[PDB]
Structures are given as structure tokens and as C-alpha cells.
């Protein structure tokens, strides 16, 4: 009955706990005791992009390391050239409350979503010079939190109704739906080889998903409050999470437990965004404090600080060739660091 | 500069020419967030104010004396709201509607008001409070079937304040109960405030037509206080 099932669940949880305790034969910080610190990392602004009218809420770099897309809650999606600070495109939206955006790897499409439970897909290269709406994808019962392209005909969405979905653009219907969380989902990140993806939920829960089968394979716990950001390490064998309790942590998918935790005693505000560097030696985090912190991944110490914002930092990104860092905050400005 | 550079700069200049029009249109429109429970009459106030003119949000536009208000109502969401509420940290006002004829559910309304009043991202946003469905309260108190002191003991020692205005000619008991309910909210509002935001209470029923003016007057008061803060 129900009681027998609950007892079985507790027993298997205990067995999993023993299996995970039996594997930690070494400490990450003790092997890395002999590694040289990177030193002090001072970074300066090279450009400041002005033009939004309200909070900037999402951002994304392009495959060409030269073009950006940015989204604001005044109802705008702007496409920038970061070399000359020129504006290439500016698109108005049907719904003002936007919470995510993305580029496509081929540079032909963009996507957006928000409180209205819809993902809108836009075409950049048309017969004329106009950017027009190609698709409206519907089927969720909650707001969209994140979306990322796989190719020109497949997209992934995560929502605040506790489920994730894979969509085929040409027809307009779901091919597979992933369930298992209890609270809302907050973020996603795609593998370098594009066959799996990770998810973090408004709980102390993160999961790994196989796209083709459509089922979960691993779950990870360890936080105290909501998870806010997540991303992949370059080799696809790690990920780093931030949470609304002033703690970041690193997980690996082969030892199946955490390895390092980045925290401090005077930090009492949560993390909003996370992003890795090219070689894996820098980990960049945003705090509503209102700062950005640059941590050394293998030592758990702050290598640098970035300041110059007057309000909460909400989005952060790095390039594919590793030549810049872009930061966007609730004061309506974007800044590029190098 | 070659042909390409001139083309790029010209296109950028046109884009800025458009954003200038957008900024003027944006700053002259006011935005309000509407909140209430399922037994509130909130839908009826929406339908009433519409005379002044699936989906996860609903929008209404109305206009008073050439000023434009956009009111936003939340639908098709779950029962947890500690995340999307943060999107509403730069609105002019929150309109909170509450049913005052149901004694069994007033405590939940009070706790809701406490949670909204003390959040981190909403310490600058003011609240306009509507106490709805007064005729039902009048009928229930006059009939005398259920006793208010069963749920709130302190009502056994409350005296009508001197600044009351029972204008229409009602029974004194209606005035006592009405002002007790109002003071229950004013106490929370006064206790934890810091002079940075206020609460404006009103008594409303299902046939009133004066709600738009009330919102209008309260908004003028809010904006004057901002402009006076600008001059120190």
C-alpha cells in the first residue's frame, strides 16, 4: 500500500546515501592545495550601450562573437553590434513582460517568451529587409523561464508549471515532454555535443535529461532554498549552480556528488546569474548587491570584483572566442568588459 | 568611410529617431497591478471599469481626464507567487480587493496584506485598499445570526472612534463593525511603515461608479510626494 511504498522509498534513499558516502575518498581543496592563485583580475569597461527604457531582463551572445540580442520589460528586443556600438535591429513585441531570449546557431532566427505562456520565433533574413514573426508555440500552463535552440527546426522550453518540452517548429507541436519536478523550473543549459541537458528547480533539486529517450537519469540535491542559475562546463562533464541563499556549488556527473562550494560569511544576498570562462578557470556570478564576482574555480576564492552598476544585476555572458564579458542590470545599461 | 560604414551609421540614426518617439509615449502611461481572492468581486470591478474605455495574463485600458491607465490581472498561473510578483516592482500602485462579509476568511486576507506590505521589492509601492460587499455585512449584522466576537475577541471592548462619518443614516452597530474591520488593516499599515509608502482605504459595493476617480486622486497624491522628495 501507500505505507509500504513510502518505507521502500526511505530504504532506497538510505541505500543511495550510503553509496554516495562510500565514494568520497579525496577532497577537491586538498589536491588543489598546491595550485598557484591567479592573482588580482582587474577589468575595465570598453563600451557602454544605452537605449533601453526599463530593466534589462535577459541577454545572449551570438555565434559570431560580434552581435548581441537583449530584451527589456518596456517591450523591446534589440540587436547590437558590439564593435562599433551600432544598432542593427530593434523589434517590438506583443507582450511586454519578457523573461528570456536566444540566438540560433546559424544566425537566422531569434526567440522570446514570458508571462504569457507562449514562445515566439522571429525570422531575421527575409526577402525584404523586415523582421517578422514566423511561429507562436503554445501548450504550456505557466510562464516561460528559459529557451535555447538546437537547430533551425528544434527548440527546448522550460516553464513555471514544473515541466519541460521539446518542440518541432515546422509543424508546431510537442515531440516529448519531461516531468518530475515539484516546483517551478528556472534555467537550462545544452551540452557541447547537444544530446543531454540539465535543469534546476525552485527547490534544492537539479536533474539531467536525455533528449531522445525522454526520461531523467540523475538527480542532485544539496541547497537550502531556490536555485536561480545553472550552466555547463566546457567538456560537458560538470555544472555549477547558484541559489537564493548566498551559495554556489559544483557538481560532476560521474562521481554523482558535489566537489566544491563557493561562499563567504559577509555575503547575505543571493545569486542571479552564472557563466563560465573558456578554459574553466574563471567562474562569473552576479549578485543583487549590486556586484559581479569573479571566482577561481579550483580554489574557492574571489579573484576579482566588477562594479559600476546602480541596481540589481540580472544577466551575464561570455563569448565563444573568450574576448569579452557582457553584463546587464536593472538600471537599463549594458557594459562590455575586457 | 566606405559604403558599408555609411550605411550602418544611417541605419543606426533612424533606429534612434524611432526610440525617441517610443520614450515619450512610454513615460506618459500609468500601470497598476490588481490583486484579490476568488470570493472578492474583482471580476465585477473589472467589468464595471471597462465602461471607461490558455492566456497567462489579462489587460484592461481605461482613461480619466486624458490620463491613461493600464490595469493588469493575473490568470492561468499556479498558487505560488513568490517569483513573478517581482516583475511588478515599478508600478504606480497595487489595488487590493477584499470581501468583508465572510468572517471565516478575513484572517487569510490579513495575512496576505502583511506579506505584500513587507516584501523587499515592494517597499516603495503603495496600496489602494477596497473593502467590498458592504450590503451583505449590513444584512448579516442586522439579522444577528452570527456573532463577530466569536472570531475576534477584542471586538467586545471596542468603541466607535470620534472621527467617524456615518453619513447615510445607518444603525450604530453597522458603523462599529465596519470601522473595526478597517482598523484591523490600518494597524498593520501603520506599524511597520517608514513614511515611504501609505495605504488608502475605501468602502465600496457592487453598484458603485466612483472607483476610477478614487484611483485618480490617490495617484496624484503619490506623484506629488515623489516630486516633493526631488526638491529635498
Amino acid at each position, epitope marked *: 500500500e501507500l505505507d509500504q511504498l513510502r518505507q521502500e522509498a526511505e530504504q532506497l534513499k538510505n541505500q543511495i546515501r550510503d553509496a554516495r558516502k562510500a565514494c568520497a575518498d579525496a577532497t577537491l581543496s586538498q589536491i588543489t592545495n598546491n595550485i598557484d592563485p591567479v592573482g588580482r583580475i582587474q577589468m575595465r569597461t570598453r563600451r557602454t550601450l544605452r537605449g533601453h527604457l526599463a530593466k534589462i531582463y535577459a541577454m545572449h551572445w551570438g555565434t559570431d562573437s560580434r552581435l548581441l540580442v537583449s530584451a527589456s520589460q518596456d517591450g523591446k528586443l534589440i540587436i547590437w553590434d558590439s564593435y562599433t556600438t551600432n544598432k542593427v535591429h530593434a523589434i517590438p513585441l506583443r507582450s511586454s513582460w519578457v523573461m528570456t531570449c536566444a540566438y540560433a546557431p546559424s544566425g537566422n532566427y531569434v526567440a522570446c517568451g514570458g508571462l504569457d505562456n507562449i514562445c515566439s520565433i522571429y525570422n531575421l533574413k527575409t526577402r525584404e529587409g523586415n523582421v517578422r514573426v514566423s511561429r507562436e508555440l503554445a501548450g504550456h500552463t505557466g510562464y516561460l523561464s528559459c529557451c535555447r535552440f538546437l537547430d533551425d527546426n528544434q527548440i527546448v522550453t522550460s516553464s513555471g508549471d514544473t515541466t519541460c518540452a521539446l518542440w518541432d517548429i515546422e509543424t508546431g507541436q510537442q515531440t516529448t515532454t519531461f516531468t518530475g519536478h*515539484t*516546483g517551478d523550473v528556472m534555467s537550462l543549459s545544452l551540452a557541447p555535443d547537444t544530446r543531454l541537458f540539465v535543469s534546476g528547480a*525552485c*527547490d*534544492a533539486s537539479a536533474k539531467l535529461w536525455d533528449v531522445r529517450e525522454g526520461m531523467c537519469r540523475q538527480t542532485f*540535491t544539496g541547497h*537550502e*532554498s*531556490d536555485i536561480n542559475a545553472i550552466c555547463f562546463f566546457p567538456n560537458g562533464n560538470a555544472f555549477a549552480t547558484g541559489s*537564493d*541563499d548566498a551559495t554556489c556549488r559544483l557538481f560532476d556527473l560521474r562521481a554523482d556528488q558535489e566537489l566544491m562550494t563557493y561562499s563567504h560569511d559577509n555575503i*547575505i544576498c*543571493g545569486i542571479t546569474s552564472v557563466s563560465f570562462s573558456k578554459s574553466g578557470r574563471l567562474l562569473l556570478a552576479g549578485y543583487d548587491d549590486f556586484n559581479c564576482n569573479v571566482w577561481d574555480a579550483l580554489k574557492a576564492d574571489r579573484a576579482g570584483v566588477l562594479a559600476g552598476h546602480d541596481n540589481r544585476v540580472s544577466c551575464l555572458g561570455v563569448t565563444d572566442d573568450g574576448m569579452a564579458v557582457a553584463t546587464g542590470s536593472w538600471d537599463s545599461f549594458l557594459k562590455i568588459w575586457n | 568611410l566606405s559604403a558599408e560604414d555609411k550605411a550602418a551609421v544611417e541605419r543606426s540614426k533612424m533606429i534612434e529617431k524611432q526610440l525617441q518617439k517610443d520614450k515619450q509615449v512610454y513615460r506618459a502611461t500609468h500601470r497598476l497591478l490588481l490583486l484579490g481572492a476568488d470570493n472578492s468581486g474583482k471580476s465585477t470591478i473589472v467589468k464595471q471599469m471597462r465602461i471607461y474605455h490558455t492566456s497567462g495574463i489579462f489587460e484592461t485600458k481605461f482613461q480619466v481626464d486624458k490620463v491613461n491607465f493600464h490595469m493588469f490581472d493575473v490568470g492561468a498561473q499556479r*498558487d*505560488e*507567487r*513568490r517569483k513573478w*510578483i517581482q516583475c511588478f516592482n515599478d508600478v504606480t500602485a497595487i489595488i487590493f480587493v477584499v470581501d468583508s462579509s465572510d468572517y471565516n476568511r478575513l*484572517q*487569510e486576507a490579513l*495575512n496576505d496584506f*502583511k*506579506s505584500i506590505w*513587507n*516584501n*523587499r521589492w515592494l517597499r516603495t509601492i503603495s496600496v489602494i485598499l477596497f473593502l467590498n460587499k458592504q450590503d451583505l455585512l449590513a444584512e448579516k449584522v442586522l439579522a444577528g445570526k452570527s456573532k463577530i466576537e466569536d*472570531y*475576534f*475577541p477584542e471586538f467586545a471592548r471596542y468603541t466607535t472612534p470620534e472621527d467617524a462619518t456615518p453619513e447615510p443614516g445607518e444603525d450604530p452597530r453597522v458603523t462599529r463593525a465596519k470601522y473595526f474591520i478597517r482598523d484591523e488593516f490600518l494597524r498593520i499599515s501603520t506599524a511597520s511603515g517608514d513614511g515611504r509608502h501609505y495605504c488608502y482605504p475605501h468602502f465600496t459595493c457592487s453598484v458603485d461608479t466612483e472607483n476610477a476617480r478614487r484611483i485618480f486622486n490617490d495617484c496624484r497624491d503619490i506623484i506629488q510626494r515623489m516630486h516633493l522628495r526631488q526638491y529635498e
Partner: nanobody, 127 residues
Framework: QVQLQESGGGLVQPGGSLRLSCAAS????????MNWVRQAPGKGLEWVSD????????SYTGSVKGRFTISRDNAKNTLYLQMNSLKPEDTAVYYC?????????????????????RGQGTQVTVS
């Protein structure tokens, strides 16, 4: 992994008394605001009592204002409630509830149909 476990239920006569204990694991106990909620046979989730980080601020609902007493032990990781005179209108299932964020005075989403950080509950019957 956040865990909350309740204890102290049972059956009593009208006018009786008993004590409820909530035990915790998986977080720093000191930084969080704490609550008592209950569910009666045929209704939704209600709110009974509230206590703050240090214990210098308390709050009760009207219907139990003169009878039930709340306390917290931050060193033993426990929340305590004491019941002195019971009516038949108290037969219910009792849960102890946490808050989503540390260092905060607001408290959203405790009485919801699904909430992450909440225990299994205990049964109290008076007859």
C-alpha cells in the same frame, strides 16, 4: 535535503492538554521564520501561530489566542507548541512550516496546496 518531522498527536477528552514537537534537519535553524498550520476534516489549510528568528516576536490567531503557547529551541533544532484546553473544533492534522528565504520578514506560499518545505503531519482528536 530539507526534512521536517512532527510528533505528539493522539486522542484526548475535552478540556485536556498536550504538546507538539517539530524536529528539523538539513539547514541552519537560526535564520528562518517559523509557523504552525493545520487542516480540518473538510476545509483548506489554515494558519495558527508564528514565531521569529530570535523569539522576541510572536503572533497568534484569534480562535486560539488565550489557550495555545508557541516556543522555539534554536540549539536543539526544535519547534514547540503547547495546548491547554481543547474544544471539539480542534480535531485536525498539524504541520510545522518554514520560510523560503533567510534574513526576511515576508513569508509567501506556506498554506499552498503544494509547498516544498513542509512535513508529513500529526493527528489530533478530541472527543
Amino acid at each position: 535535503q530539507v526534512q521536517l518531522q512532527e510528533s505528539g498527536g493522539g486522542l484526548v477528552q475535552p478540556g485536556g492538554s498536550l504538546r507538539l514537537s517539530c524536529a528539523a534537519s538539513g539547514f541552519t535553524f537560526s535564520n528562518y521564520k517559523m509557523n504552525w498550520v493545520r487542516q480540518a476534516p473538510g476545509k483548506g489549510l489554515e494558519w495558527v501561530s508564528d514565531i521569529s528568528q530570535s523569539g522576541a516576536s510572536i503572533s497568534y490567531t484569534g480562535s486560539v489566542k488565550g489557550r495555545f503557547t508557541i516556543s522555539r529551541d534554536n540549539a536543539k533544532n526544535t519547534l514547540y507548541l503547547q495546548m491547554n484546553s481543547l474544544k471539539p473544533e480542534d480535531t485536525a492534522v498539524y504541520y510545522c512550516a518554514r520560510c523560503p528565504a533567510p534574513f526576511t520578514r515576508d513569508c509567501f506560499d506556506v498554506t499552498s496546496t503544494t509547498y516544498a518545505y513542509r512535513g508529513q503531519g500529526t493527528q489530533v482528536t478530541v472527543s
